[PDB]
Nucleic acid binder design. Structure first.
Lengths: 91, 48, 151, 219
RNA sequence: ACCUGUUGUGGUGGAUGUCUUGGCCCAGGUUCUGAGGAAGGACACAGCAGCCUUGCGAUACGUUCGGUGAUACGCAGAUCU
RNA sequence: GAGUAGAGUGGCUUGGGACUGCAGUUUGAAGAGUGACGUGUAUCCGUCACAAGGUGGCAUACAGACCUGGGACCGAUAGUGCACAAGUAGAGUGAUCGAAGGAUGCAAAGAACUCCGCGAAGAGGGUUAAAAGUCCCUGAAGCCGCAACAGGAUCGGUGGUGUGCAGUGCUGUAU
RNA sequence: UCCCCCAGCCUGACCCCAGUGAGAAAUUGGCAGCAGAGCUUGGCACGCAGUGCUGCUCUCUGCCCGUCUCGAAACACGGACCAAGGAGUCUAAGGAGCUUGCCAGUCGGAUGGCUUCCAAAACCUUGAGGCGUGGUGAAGGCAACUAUCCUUCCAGAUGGGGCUAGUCUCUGCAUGGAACGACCGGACCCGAAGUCCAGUGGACAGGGUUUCGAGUGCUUGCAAGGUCCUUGGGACCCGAAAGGUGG
RNA sequence: GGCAUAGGGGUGAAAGGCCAAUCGAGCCACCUAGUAGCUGGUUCCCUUCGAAGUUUCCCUCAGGAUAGCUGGGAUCCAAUGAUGCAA
RNA sequence: GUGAAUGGGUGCGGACAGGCAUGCUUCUUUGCCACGACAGGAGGCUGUGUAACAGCAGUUCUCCCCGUCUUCUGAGCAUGUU
RNA sequence: UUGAACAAUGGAUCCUACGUGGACCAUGACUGGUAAGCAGUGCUGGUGAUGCGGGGUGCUCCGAGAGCAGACUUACAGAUCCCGAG
RNA sequence: GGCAGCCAAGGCAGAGCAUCGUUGUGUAGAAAGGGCAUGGACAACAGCUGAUCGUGUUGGGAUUGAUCCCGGCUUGAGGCGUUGCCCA
RNA sequence: CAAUCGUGGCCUAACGAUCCUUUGGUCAAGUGUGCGAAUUCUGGAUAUCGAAGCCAGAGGUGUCAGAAAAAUUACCACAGGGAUAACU
């Protein structure tokens, strides 16, 4: 006739039978909802992306830029090195 | 054709093919299961 | 094996439930005839959740209704450009490769009315059909062949 | 109703289809199929033995193209030849045609010359494969009949001619490779289709346009 | 002596096993009644017969004729090779 | 091919939806055409057919009843209500309702004769492979009689447990 | 709290000398080279050992089952006894696994060819067509880019080539997630510039979107059987008070 | 004694009385095995796994659908000791 | 106005961590030229090993300084390196 | 110092047939009520679904959890006798 | 799960064989876990049966169990069983 | 001035499915000082005739996830219920 309606008794037990986990934790989340300016900019950036070979030779050129200075100064230092070693001997 | 139906169509985000037993409508506008919960005209449309 | 040795039983679960009083339907909630309705009863009241969850677009009316819907004048099986050169005896496909002649593909012979333009084409062929997409026309024309409207 | 995802039942068995004690039922079980196959075969060969020295089917039927756009290319058998096909073949008497075993259909006409020619040559290969027996067994004897065609009347099972469908299954046979034609190079078939479909839709508009043009011409 | 039991045996009882001139089912064919009297219902009819008979009607378990060819039968009784 | 087709309206019917078909009623054509062309109407055009009369075989249906062939069917509480003197006995004023009921034996060889008794029986003695004895293939359980043996106050029970004691089998068994 | 002097306590490793010792395992059906846990005694018919059964006795126990219920031994329901009967079945459609065959096909026993009963079987591909190969739009309708190959990214099954018990590159299936500068159809916005012609001025075309699809991105299909089920059916079996038609 | 009035009907000095031991709608056959969210029953053994009386919506409160718990089938990987000696 | 106990969310690293160089963008910025031009000096410096720092190796070395030329915005996404 | 401890045969991806959806008990966490073997709640565990040892008896207390046996030892709790243990 | 040191065993690859380890309650419910059992079809047992079928009854043995096998007696056939699989 | 702020009420209540109807839009027309840019009524067309369609509102279900709804029975009945009163 008159029931005992609401109860939260066995609910933690049922809820803990299997581990309480998030379904997708490593999965990426959709880009839908991300700000429109950032989405458009990601699209256009990726469009403009250069290729790995062009990037490799670009980085090579950047490394070669300051080479005449670096190699010269380094060889000068390497020449002055043995004098330093022979002075450090006298200690 | 089973994997496509796995899940529930009436769950937002799940794009499950509704289970249609042998009923392939000829008028694709007056199709089966395409009105209430399939167009926002009919008070709501299942979310994508 | 041993599993194959068991080609037994005809109503396995029913004959297994012999000796158990409720016959697999419970003591508390009996197996009683039609405890929820007959057929799709209650689609909007007590099976509202079920209908909403498993059959959304039920319960409504949409679209132009067409009295005396003829379907023979709407029958139009479609094929694609990817499935054309299979329909040419490759002797023709070989003797026409670089040369100017193009083999003729009559789609009605195989049962296709329209030609859809998905799939690349290797060499130009002449395609007779009852309709073409503009993609199919574009691909055939660029490959070298021609589309032909045929009754 | 299922506690699952199964489709909506749509069962259609609400009206006493079941032969129970109270009902007679709406059930017909075709257990006679096996025996009736043999019975049909037996009565068919009894028909042959009855109308023996004649085709077992018996009337030459014409070949007509199936009706709709879906079955345009499929040919099949008709009910009888048109009187134009008869007159072209050489028969001007429908009742005599019928008595010698050519079927007539005055309801049919030839909407084209192809059907006329096809069924005319059909009747003409008939009436040459045909050996008429003479009435009263010893009077006049027609041409071609060699006095032992009457000694050896053979009842063929199918009527000499190829299958009915083998007349559309020959028109549906492409040609050999060919050169393109410059109209086949310039022609835009999709543009043509869209044009001839927009044509039937722009009719009243292509009248209001003229009306406006001539009103502005007046003004 | 009475009770309880276990055997043996005897009764009451008709379960079992096996079968079946019966049913049920499927397929094929026919559908062939009647005012010239139908379908049904009565009352009759047998040496010993009450019932039953898709027996029969005062010619009444039967009449003519054909096919068969020595029985029929629960008793008798004269016909029959 | 005229109270017709159609139309207003009412009612049934149909998937037929500004009405598929039918019917009443009011109305009621054309025939220098008409009907249908699945959205009511008006205007043009086209296709098909020729209603308001009639015949008309074939392929088709066939749970009854008769003539047949079959069956992964039932096997006397089953299969038809009926395997049988079953639509019977019986019940009801009646409309109607409606059962139970199969099996001797190879062969009736169906139990001669004797004793006892009024007689049925019974005791002998027979038929028969056998009483299988017109209750007749077999004859279960429940229940009952009798004899033998074992016990007998106590939910201190039925049943379980571990021994014992009597009765009773079974298995193995060295030199 | 750190340092110095004098000393000292406990203890590790190593160098030297003496003494002392050589470590685990080794039948597990048997044979194999070793290794190897069993043996003795007394008794028993031609009785002994063991084991059941029935009854009785003794120790410890022992409520009456089925059911509904939080709760039954219940003063809650059914239950005197025995026998025989007795209740999840078939069908149309369908779902998700599993099995089998074929494959962009598959099935085709409506029907057709054959051959005393069996045989209404078996066999045959004459087979329309069913399902699938394309989806999207209310509809008018339209219809999935890519010319050496190949959508991208993260994780990832195999495999290759170097290399090294440190360990680098290439491949990247399946699955899950994200993306798409991709494309098909629908809906928006700015436009309709541009190219073209089966030319009644019509056909597409461009750039943008917080856009939708049961979309595509190397077609995941068909048929049969089987299992568990669903819905209509008497529908697991029995069960109303009722309603109707005719007498 | 004869005859007449019949079931939603008859008849009644009215009690809803009476109409074949039947009456606030007789009986008889059929629809009909009516429907029942309700009560009762649901037939062999062993092994293994094993709950819920809670959520939401419902003319819903003795019932359902919906999550949850409960069984099974899996798929992609992962993880997974054990030489008596002698030869 | 304070505020426990018991509680709740998150984080606790690769051998994917962390660092470094570079690219792209229509987004952001005043922040572009520039994926450009130019450029000196000091130095027992740097690393492994050590409280004795001895010793050993030299790799486009260390510092002024990730310099100057008006002096070089971030973010997101990638390419390489360790 | 592979940069907290402990544990871990586990993580990911799914499909699918059911039963259940009357609950009840215990505790300064409580609310209504004078109160109730009352009514309604919270955390957790039990009963239901669970037998076994003890509480004489008792669905819920205390111990402990249940394959068939043998030996040893104990939990709760016990030792006048009933009744094993002074 | 033969390409094995040899015999013995096993030898049906979801089987079997050897060793080791873990774990054993259960209502509703389930098992693509395993079996007992009944009627009949298709097959196998050159199966049994008048030197006595089947039923039944009484003892015995096997089995965790569903149940299986046998002896005695009744009884006498108008018979029965074991295995695979299929239809209930 | 600008940064900004502003798509209702400082914030936490103040409200409503299918089907139907209605209005607006689509369409159609109009503009278009030259071009376009389009839903349907199926035998082909026309018609600011009519109807249908799609899109956005509105007309309401307050029992507010939304049936269309008065009593009585002491003449009563059925399926149940100790889920639930009257007696112990």
């Amino acid at each position: 006739a008159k029931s005992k309606n609401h109860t939260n008794h066995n609910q933690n037990y049922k809820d803990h039978r299997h581990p309480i986990r998030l379904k997708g934790r490593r999965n990426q989340i959709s880009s839908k909802g991300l700000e429109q300016k950032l989405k458009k900019n990601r699209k256009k950036s990726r469009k403009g992306f250069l290729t790995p070979d062009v990037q490799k030779e670009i980085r090579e050129k950047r490394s070669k830029k300051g080479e005449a200075r670096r190699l010269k100064s380094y060889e000068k230092f390497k020449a002055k090195l043995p004098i330093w070693k022979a002075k450090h001997k006298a200690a | 054709k089973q994997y496509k139906s796995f899940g529930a169509p009436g769950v937002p985000g799940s794009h499950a093919v509704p289970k249609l037993g042998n009923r392939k409508s000829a008028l694709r506008g007056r199709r089966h299961e395409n009105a209430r919960g399939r167009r926002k005209s009919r008070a709501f449309k299942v979310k994508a | 094996t041993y599993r194959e040795r068991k080609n037994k039983g005809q109503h396995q679960k029913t004959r297994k439930l012999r000796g158990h009083v409720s016959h697999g339907h419970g003591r508390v909630g009996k197996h009683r005839k039609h405890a929820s309705g007959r057929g799709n009863a209650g689609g909007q009241h007590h099976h509202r959740i079920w209908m909403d969850k498993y059959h959304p677009g039920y319960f409504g009316k949409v679209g132009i209704r067409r009295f005396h819907y003829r379907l023979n004048p709407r029958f139009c099986p479609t094929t694609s450009i990817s499935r054309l050169l299979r329909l040419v005896p490759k002797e023709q496909l070989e003797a026409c490769k670089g040369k100017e002649e193009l083999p003729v593909v009559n789609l009605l012979q195989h049962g296709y009315f329209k030609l859809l333009g998905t799939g690349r084409l290797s060499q130009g062929v002449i395609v007779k059909a009852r309709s073409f997409s503009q993609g199919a026309e574009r691909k055939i024309k660029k490959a070298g062949g021609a589309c032909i409207l045929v009754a | 109703v299922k506690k699952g995802n199964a489709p909506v039942p749509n069962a259609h068995f609400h009206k006493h289809w079941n032969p129970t004690g109270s009902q007679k039922g709406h059930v017909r079980c075709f257990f006679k199929q096996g025996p009736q196959k043999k019975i049909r075969r037996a009565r068919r060969q009894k028909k042959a033995a009855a109308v023996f020295p004649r085709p077992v089917k018996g009337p030459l039927r014409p070949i007509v193209h199936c009706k709709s756009q879906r079955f345009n290319m499929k040919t099949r058998l008709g009910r009888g030849f048109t009187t134009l096909e008869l007159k072209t073949a050489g028969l001007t008497d429908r009742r005599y045609a019928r008595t010698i075993g050519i079927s007539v259909d005055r309801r049919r006409r030839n909407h084209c010359e192809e059907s006329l020619a096809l069924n005319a040559e059909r009747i003409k290969t008939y009436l040459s494969k045909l050996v008429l027996f003479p009435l009263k067994a010893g009077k006049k004897l027609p041409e071609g009949v060699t006095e032992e065609d009457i000694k050896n009347p053979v009842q063929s099972k199918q009527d000499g001619f190829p299958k009915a469908s083998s007349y559309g299954k020959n028109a549906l046979k492409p040609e050999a490779p060919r050169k393109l034609t410059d109209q086949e190079k310039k022609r835009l078939t999709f543009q043509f289709l869209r044009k001839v479909q927009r044509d039937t839709k722009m009719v009243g508009k292509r009248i209001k346009r003229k009306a406006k043009k001539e009103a502005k011409a007046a003004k």
